Design a protein around this motif. Structure first.
Motif, PDB file in Angstrom:
ATOM      1  N   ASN A 236       0.586  -1.896  -1.394  1.00 29.51           N
ATOM      2  CA  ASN A 236      -0.772  -1.865  -1.603  1.00 29.51           C
ATOM      3  C   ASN A 236      -1.498  -2.331  -0.225  1.00 29.51           C
ATOM      4  N   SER A 237      -1.073  -2.815   0.016  1.00 28.66           N
ATOM      5  CA  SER A 237      -2.094  -3.340   1.365  1.00 28.66           C
ATOM      6  C   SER A 237      -1.696  -3.247   3.089  1.00 28.66           C
ATOM      7  N   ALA A 238      -0.925  -1.825   2.673  1.00 25.77           N
ATOM      8  CA  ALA A 238      -0.497  -1.217   3.994  1.00 25.77           C
ATOM      9  C   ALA A 238      -1.454  -0.562   4.675  1.00 25.77           C
ATOM     10  N   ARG A 239      -1.679  -0.868   5.995  1.00 27.16           N
ATOM     11  CA  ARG A 239      -2.497   0.111   6.752  1.00 27.16           C
ATOM     12  C   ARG A 239      -2.749   1.558   7.213  1.00 27.16           C
ATOM     13  N   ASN A 240      -1.478   1.649   8.032  1.00 21.48           N
ATOM     14  CA  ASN A 240      -1.480   3.700   8.999  1.00 21.48           C
ATOM     15  C   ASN A 240      -1.137   3.905   8.150  1.00 21.48           C
ATOM     16  N   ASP A 241      -0.619   4.229   6.760  1.00 26.03           N
ATOM     17  CA  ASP A 241       0.158   4.523   5.384  1.00 26.03           C
ATOM     18  C   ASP A 241       1.478   5.065   5.755  1.00 26.03           C
ATOM     19  N   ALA A 242       1.654   4.943   6.966  1.00 26.12           N
ATOM     20  CA  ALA A 242       2.886   5.340   7.708  1.00 26.12           C
ATOM     21  C   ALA A 242       3.662   4.330   6.908  1.00 26.12           C
ATOM     22  N   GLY A 244       3.456   2.327   4.277  1.00 29.42           N
ATOM     23  CA  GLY A 244       3.694   2.430   2.780  1.00 29.42           C
ATOM     24  C   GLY A 244       4.215   3.628   2.520  1.00 29.42           C
ATOM     25  N   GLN A 245       4.130   4.756   3.288  1.00 31.74           N
ATOM     26  CA  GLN A 245       5.226   5.138   3.264  1.00 31.74           C
ATOM     27  C   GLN A 245       7.062   5.112   3.211  1.00 31.74           C
ATOM     28  N   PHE A 246       7.386   4.383   4.138  1.00 25.80           N
ATOM     29  CA  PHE A 246       8.453   3.691   3.885  1.00 25.80           C
ATOM     30  C   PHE A 246       8.755   2.404   3.693  1.00 25.80           C
ATOM     31  N   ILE A 247       7.888   1.403   2.417  1.00 27.16           N
ATOM     32  CA  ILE A 247       7.642   0.774   1.285  1.00 27.16           C
ATOM     33  C   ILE A 247       8.261   1.743   0.583  1.00 27.16           C
ATOM     34  N   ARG A 248       7.830   2.576   0.159  1.00 28.01           N
ATOM     35  CA  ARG A 248       7.785   3.418  -1.135  1.00 28.01           C
ATOM     36  C   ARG A 248       8.757   3.955  -1.021  1.00 28.01           C
ATOM     37  N   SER A 249       9.512   4.632  -0.279  1.00 28.50           N
ATOM     38  CA  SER A 249      10.952   4.942   0.020  1.00 28.50           C
ATOM     39  C   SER A 249      12.292   4.467  -0.171  1.00 28.50           C
ATOM     40  N   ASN A 250      11.620   2.896   0.697  1.00 25.60           N
ATOM     41  CA  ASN A 250      13.078   1.520   0.225  1.00 25.60           C
ATOM     42  C   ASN A 250      12.358   1.511  -1.000  1.00 25.60           C
ATOM     43  N   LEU A 251      11.678   1.086  -1.815  1.00 26.84           N
ATOM     44  CA  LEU A 251      11.514   0.827  -2.785  1.00 26.84           C
ATOM     45  C   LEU A 251      11.880   2.162  -4.459  1.00 26.84           C
TER      46      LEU A 251
END
Lengths: 405, 201, 100, 48, 49
Positions: A236-242, A244-251
């Motif tokens: 939720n607190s990620a910056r570049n949004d890249a 955030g997409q990475f973490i969403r995918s992993n999740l």
DNA sequence: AGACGGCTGGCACGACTTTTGCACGATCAGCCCTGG
DNA sequence: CCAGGGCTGATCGTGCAAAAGTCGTGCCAGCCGTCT
């Protein structure tokens, strides 16, 4: 029914070791956490190689004879026989100088070492070496020597009548001399260590408390894959949004994998209950009392399909106080029985085993007789089925099994 | 024997953790700051030419965060184990030894007599030994022969290999995961945490 | 495969097997001095091919053919004593009770 | 007596033959210690 | 080969004559090693590493 | 000593069961745009 | 300012028909004990 389901399916069809292989192997790609000294004691066992080496040192050879001998003992196997050949050692030493008798000379003395007859040359020089050893006061040493020398091919047929007129022997006296050869007890290399380590395939467990055994999976075997709560909150607190997409995918993949795994576990347990509900008979009484079961019967039990259970039960093991068994072992074909009933093949197999083991060993029973006996008991089977069940249990012969009455 | 790359220039534990701060005697840095740099919670500066900052000054996360926009990208700082490596490699032995000798010869006092000659003696003994300071860290990690570490069969098929190979497999899997994450351009916080865990292992 | 006791181990004469019973254990009351065979246990080995060379010795000497080893009890070094009683346990579903 | 696997073997051979001669060789525990120390960032070697 | 000096090559005991200690350079570590190390040690099926 | 009949093992007809890849696309609630 | 409609990310369902293996069992050839 896309890719996700696709992979989830291959997840349960394989054994638990390859499952843990893929699980752990794919646990390094995406952040998804799985979660009296050095030598125990240490002991250096001797062995019939080191024991043959020990003797070499004590004995007096030259510097050249010592090498030959080292080479010879390398060729010795667990059985006790020089593995290769005579001339082979001469050709492997790379020196054309060293004669072929040179090795013979050494090899003629190494084979009177500890177990005499070690490093024999083709399962026959053993007898010659072993016989020459003990004294010449033995009753029929001449005769036995003569037998062994050129007349083993004839002895191979387990025939004794021919040996009289061939090699000019007496009337059956040689026979007692042929018993001397039987006591020789060849292969003195196999005095080896009987240290075969113990084996196992533990997977699910069955334990009999208060009647009606309850089936429950292994505490240690089963793999538990959890998600990290630490990296969860970090999206939720990620910056570049890249990021955030990475973490969403992993999740999302992690959750998917978790559910898949659990689904496997739950399915395994369910299939581990049905059988026990159906086959209480077997765990109590034995193989003789198994009821037949099919995939279609298990699928019909509890909201299941054939295809699905077909994959779960492949390379799966169950430990009960009866023994250790694969789940595929429980399923078998049936035959028509008296009163409209169906009899399992395993029951007939155990019956054949116990019937052959308890038959008269003097005169063996033919498959036709066994078929008739089974028909009298109320089983109603053909002669071909009996033949197949007998052949399947590492018993090719039926009538050739005849020993001394 | 063998060797492990570790995919990161990790530091050694016998140094900077014994009674004398061997990594601190060469860098003239307190033990607290050196221990804080290795755990990604200091983010010390490396070298600044035009920026109004010292060479080996202590920094913090928020300080670097709100000072990056001030001096731009000229301020070079590292929060990992490579920071000490760079600070130790970007240092001349004789150039500092000459300055230390000049300071010890020109300025003679009570406090100047102590805590200064020991550093000069250490520098001289390290130069005369022929060893390189950057070698105090282990970029490549060798392993001991496996014959000295048996499988330890306790009962049956017990091949856990505990108390000597668990750390080995842990470090191996940590390095593999770190390399896998670095090959995919993972975020900075995740790779920093992974490097910190690998250093701890 | 499984391991069973049959008291027919090769590489040993009838001298040591004289104290053994038809199942593998020794009779009660028998004296044992040093390393003597008390329980005759064998370990089966892997199957072999046709190998007529080995089939020669397989058919000549009976039913040995490198199928069973000599993994008996083999008590430790010299100890002189007697046997007072034995004990044998077997899991359920096994009918190998030759003398139990 | 404990280390030097070749040394104790030569000692046994000389006692059996009656030579009664020994050699110092090299203790195996010293080599084990060298191998255990070389696993860290310490370099030790045998010069001559 | 001659198979004579090869069997005597294992006795690599000549002399000691000296002893010292220094730091392990990253270039000398690769000289001691003969390969680079998977976390698995040995399987259970065939009992081979 | 060979024909006769029992014994034994390989092969095949056919009904049943194992198993295997497989079409992807459908759906619901939060968020954003809009008329009363 | 609130409720109605469109957009879109989030979330899931472990079934289904086709090609191959298996046994129940009959058909047929090879082999041996016995009386002719």
């Amino acid at each position: 029914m896309t890719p996700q389901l696709q992979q989830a399916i291959r997840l349960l069809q394989l054994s638990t070791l390859e499952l843990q292989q893929e699980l752990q192997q794919a646990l390094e790609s995406n952040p998804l956490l799985e979660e009296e000294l050095p030598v125990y004691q240490g002991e250096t066992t001797q062995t019939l190689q080191d024991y043959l080496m020990w003797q070499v040192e004590l004995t007096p050879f030259t510097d050249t004879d010592r090498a030959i001998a080292t080479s010879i003992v390398d060729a010795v196997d667990d059985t006790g026989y020089l593995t290769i050949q005579i001339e082979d050692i001469v050709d492997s030493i790379g020196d054309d100088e060293i004669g072929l008798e040179e090795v013979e000379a050494v090899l003629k003395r190494i084979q009177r070492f500890d177990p005499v007859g070690v490093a024999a040359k083709d399962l026959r020089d053993c007898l010659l070496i072993q016989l020459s050893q003990f004294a010449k006061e033995t009753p029929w040493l001449e005769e036995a020597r003569l037998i062994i020398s050129d007349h083993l091919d004839l002895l191979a047929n387990h025939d004794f009548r021919t040996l009289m007129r061939v090699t000019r022997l007496k009337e059956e006296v040689l026979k007692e001399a042929v018993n001397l050869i039987q006591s020789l007890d060849p292969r003195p290399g196999q005095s080896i260590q009987t240290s075969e380590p113990e084996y196992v395939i533990p997977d699910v467990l069955v334990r009999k408390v208060s009647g009606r055994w309850t089936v429950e999976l292994n505490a240690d075997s089963i793999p538990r894959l959890k998600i990290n709560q630490q990296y969860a909150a970090m999206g939720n607190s990620a910056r570049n949004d890249a990021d955030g997409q990475f973490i969403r995918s992993n999740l999302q993949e992690a959750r998917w994998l978790i559910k898949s795994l659990e689904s496997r576990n739950d399915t395994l347990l369910r299939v581990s209950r049905c059988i026990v509900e159906q086959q209480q008979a077997f765990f109590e009484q034995g193989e003789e009392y198994m009821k037949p079961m099919v995939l279609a019967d298990i699928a019909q039990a509890v909201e299941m399909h054939e295809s699905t259970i077909s994959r779960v039960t492949t390379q799966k093991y169950l430990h009960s106080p009866r023994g250790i068994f694969e789940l595929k072992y429980f399923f078998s074909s049936h035959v028509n029985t008296e009163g409209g009933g169906e009899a399992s093949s395993t029951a007939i197999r155990a019956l054949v085993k116990k019937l052959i083991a308890a038959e008269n060993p003097a005169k063996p029973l033919s498959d036709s007789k066994l078929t008739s006996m089974l028909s009298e008991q109320g089983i109603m089977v053909a002669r071909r089925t009996v033949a197949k069940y007998r052949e399947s249990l590492s018993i090719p012969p039926s009538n050739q099994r005849k020993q001394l009455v | 024997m063998g060797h492990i790359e570790l995919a990161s220039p990790t530091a050694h534990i016998w140094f900077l953790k014994s009674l004398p701060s061997r990594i601190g005697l060469l860098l003239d840095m307190p033990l607290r700051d050196i221990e804080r740099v290795l755990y990604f919670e200091s983010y010390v500066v490396i070298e600044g030419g035009m920026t109004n900052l010292e060479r080996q000054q202590i920094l913090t996360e928020e300080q670097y965060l709100d000072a990056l926009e001030e001096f731009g990208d000229e301020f070079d700082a590292k929060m990992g184990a490579e920071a000490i490596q760079a600070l130790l490699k970007s240092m001349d032995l004789e150039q500092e030894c000459e300055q230390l000798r000049e300071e010890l010869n020109e300025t003679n006092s009570e406090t100047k007599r102590k805590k200064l000659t020991k550093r000069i003696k250490l520098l001289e003994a390290f130069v005369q030994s022929g060893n390189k300071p950057e070698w105090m860290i282990l970029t490549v990690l060798p392993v001991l022969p496996p014959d000295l570490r048996p499988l330890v069969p306790l009962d049956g098929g017990r091949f856990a290999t505990s108390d000597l190979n668990d750390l080995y497999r842990r470090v191996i899997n940590r390095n593999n995961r770190l390399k896998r994450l670095l090959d995919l351009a993972a975020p900075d916080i995740i790779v920093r945490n992974e490097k910190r865990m690998l250093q701890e292992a | 495969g499984p391991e069973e006791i049959t008291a027919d181990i090769p590489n040993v004469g009838e001298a040591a097997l004289s104290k053994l019973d038809e199942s593998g254990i020794v009779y009660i009351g028998a004296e044992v001095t040093g390393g003597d065979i008390l329980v005759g246990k064998v370990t089966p080995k892997g199957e072999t091919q046709l190998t007529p060379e080995e089939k020669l010795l397989r058919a000549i000497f009976g039913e040995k053919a490198s199928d069973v080893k000599d993994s008996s009890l083999r008590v430790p070094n010299g100890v002189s004593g007697t046997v007072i009683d034995v004990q044998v346990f077997t899991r359920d579903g096994v009918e190998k009770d030759k003398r139990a | 007596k404990s280390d030097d696997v070749n040394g104790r073997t030569k000692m046994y051979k000389n006692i059996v033959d009656g030579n009664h001669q020994m050699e110092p060789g090299m203790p195996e525990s010293f080599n084990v210690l060298l191998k255990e120390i070389r696993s860290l960032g310490i370099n030790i070697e045998l010069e001559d | 080969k001659d198979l004579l000096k090869f069997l005597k090559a294992q006795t690599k005991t000549e002399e000691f004559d000296a002893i010292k200690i220094a730091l392990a350079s990253p270039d000398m570590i690769r000289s001691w090693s003969f390969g680079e190390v998977k976390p698995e040690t040995i399987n259970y099926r065939t009992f081979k590493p």
